[PDB]
Design a protein around this ligand. Structure first.
Ligand SMILES: N[C@@H](CC(=O)O)C(=O)Nc1ccc(OCc2ccccc2)cc1
Ligand SMILES: [Yb+3]
Ligand SMILES: [Zn+2]
Length: 608
């Protein structure tokens, strides 16, 4: 079996067991320079040459056994990058290992990194850097078998300006002055647990920490540290629940790093140090479900890993399932069901957007010649969760299925697996209910496009009030407008307000006068909760409210979480009154945008 997203030699020929990383972070040249010492193990006899993934990497030299060797860079294959075939002096046989030392330089345009000028940061005095390697961007930082089917420990030391701090997806070893006498510190890191390379992460900036748990520090620039330490207080209690569900948390520390507004995702499950968007800082902890989710990846994702990106749903489907149990443990089973039903709604939106026969709406996909960033959506999260939730109900409830979940984590820990490994284990574990398992339409669930063949059962308690109010607005006529009032919101939680807007948004456009009335009675303009403001502005713009144009333009650019930024640029482009300003705003911003985000919005807007 082969990973169609990688150009490297497959795990069935050789495997990287370890990486030693020495490098310094160069803010003036906007480059990472250093050496990548890979311990490779052969899986065959007479292994004379292996191939690594690269993207826009400058190779300075490839040293083996103190001596240089003959390497070659192949032709670029668009988004995949270019294959780097290294020549081995002495032939390897089964399980024989060799260590290879690549001196490399990263391009300023690395799709894995965003370099921020001081003016792009909170503290206007210092620069900032961060990586984001998932899915296949690790090769844009260094030569590697850039596939999730390979796992490896790594050790790292990195030189940065002594006024700054380096952090990695590892335990911090310590800080010492650089060997070449610059004004630089050389920070050290160690990761003892085998991880896929997409989990290698690096941040370099004016970072400042604050402890919020026994195994948790929150890291951010000085001006965010205080609000964050508050927002994520619940973190350790979520960790404890996660361990109960998943088994022991094996990574040692669980730190949190709150990144600059342009971080592309809500969170990245970097081991030991989760990355999160600043858009979670709502000031009432209401978005802590994202934290629960990242915590859950410490088992589903980071311990048991999808073997290729075709089986990405294993990572995310299970993690969303654990996420919603943690929140259910914390706030009640009726809340777990509210969140699950909301997810089905987001799945509905994804299928309608792509189209119900579209290949990206299948649970298991084929990313041959597809850039994984382009296929990314809520489908693997929500169709994967739906399947696990349907199976929970089919097989006798959450207690029974969480037993399966923990056994599943236990069986495949430290491994990389496919949809079949999962399904075959489900059958093994539930060998006493095989006749129940044979009732499920596996082909449709796993391989058919569109909404799943069957919808699970959801408790409606917390959802009913959302439906009542959305339906009143959707069907409102002139003689209804005067009766709407802020008391409508009186008993609705932040989560219900959001779901109200999500439901209303599915029936957009609403009449313009109706949306003006909504602002008039609810004052949604004044809410800064990002999930809620996101959907409110989408509704205003799709309903042709010109006054919402600058609001939407502002949110789309003042932060770069793609979940918010892409749909806003897309709505603004679709609205004739804002189309031109949308396209010009993008073009004026694409230079200081994250590289992947810049590219995706461009394709969205069809610019260039
Ligand atoms: N940004 C993180 C967020 C997180 O970890 O929660 C992330 O997982 N990114 C990501 C993951 C997979 C990708 O490609 C695989 C794929 C397969 C099937 C369908 C769609 C995409 C591309 C990007
Ligand atoms: Yb009426
Ligand atoms: Zn996830």
């Amino acid at each position: 079996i082969v990973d169609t997203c990688s150009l490297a030699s497959p795990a069935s020929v050789c495997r990287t067991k370890h990486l030693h990383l020495r490098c310094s972070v160069d803010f003036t040249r906007r480059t990472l320079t250093g050496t990548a010492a890979l311990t490779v193990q052969s899986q065959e006899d007479n292994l004379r040459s292996l191939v690594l993934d690269t993207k826009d990497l400058t190779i300075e030299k490839v040293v083996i056994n103190g001596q240089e060797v003959k390497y070659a860079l192949g032709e670029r294959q668009s988004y995949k990058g270019s294959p780097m075939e290294i020549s081995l002096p002495i032939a390897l046989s089964k399980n024989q290992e060799i260590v290879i030392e690549i001196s490399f330089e990263t391009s300023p345009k690395s799709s894995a990194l965003q370099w921020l000028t001081p003016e792009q940061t909170s503290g206007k005095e210092h620069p900032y850097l961060f990586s984001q390697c998932q899915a296949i961007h690790c090769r844009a930082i260094l030569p590697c078998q850039d596939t999730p089917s390979v796992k490896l420990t790594y050790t790292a030391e990195v030189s940065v300006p002594k006024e700054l701090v380096a952090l990695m997806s590892a335990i911090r070893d310590g800080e010492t002055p650089d060997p070449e006498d610059p004004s630089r510190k050389i920070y050290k890191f160690i990761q003892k647990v085998p991880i896929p390379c997409y989990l290698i992460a690096l941040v370099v900036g004016a970072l400042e920490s604050r402890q919020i748990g026994p195994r948790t520090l929150v890291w951010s620039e000085k001006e965010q540290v205080e609000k964050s330490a508050y927002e994520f207080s619940e973190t350790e209690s979520m960790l404890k629940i996660a361990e109960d569900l998943g088994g022991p948390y094996v990574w040692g520390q669980y730190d949190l790093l709150v990144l600059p507004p342009s971080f592309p995702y809500g969170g990245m499950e970097n081991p030991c140090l989760t990355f999160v968007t600043p858009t979670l800082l709502a000031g009432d902890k209401s978005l802590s479900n994202v934290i629960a989710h990242e915590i859950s990846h410490s088992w589903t994702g980071n311990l048991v890993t999808n073997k290729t990106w075709d089986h990405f749903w294993l990572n995310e489907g299970h993690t969303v399932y654990l996420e919603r149990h943690i929140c259910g443990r914390l706030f009640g089973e009726k809340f777990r069901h509210f969140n699950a039903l909301g997810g089905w709604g987001e799945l509905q939106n994804s299928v309608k957007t792509f189209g119900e026969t579209h290949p990206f709406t299948k649970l298991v996909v084929d990313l041959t010649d597809i850039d994984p960033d382009v296929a990314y959506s809520s489908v693997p999260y929500e169709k994967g969760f739906a399947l696990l939730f349907y199976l929970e109900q089919l097989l006798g409830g959450p207690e029974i299925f969480l037993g399966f979940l923990k056994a599943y984590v236990e069986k495949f820990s430290y491994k990389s697996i496919t949809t079949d490994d999962w399904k075959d284990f489900l059958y093994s574990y539930f060998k006493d209910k095989v006749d129940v398992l044979n009732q499920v339409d596996w082909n449709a669930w796993l391989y058919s496009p569109g909404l799943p063949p069957i919808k699970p059962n959801y408790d409606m308690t917390l959802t009913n009030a959302c439906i009542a109010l959305s339906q009143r607005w959707i069907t409102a006529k002139e003689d209804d407008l005067n009766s709407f009032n802020a008391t409508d919101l009186k008993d609705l939680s932040s989560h219900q307000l959001n779901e109200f807007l999500a439901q209303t948004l599915q029936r957009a456009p609403l009449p313009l006068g109706h949306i003006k009335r909504m602002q008039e009675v609810y004052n949604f303009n004044a809410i800064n909760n990002s999930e809620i403001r996101f959907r409110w502005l989408r509704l205003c713009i799709q309903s042709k409210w010109e006054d919402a144009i600058p609001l939407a333009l502002k949110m789309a650019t003042e932060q770069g979480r793609m979940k918010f930024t892409r749909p806003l640029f897309k709505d603004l482009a679709a609205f004739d009154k804002s189309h031109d300003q949308a396209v010009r705003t993008y073009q004026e911003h694409k230079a200081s945008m994250h590289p992947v985000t810049a590219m995706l919005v461009g394709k969205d807007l069809k610019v260039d």
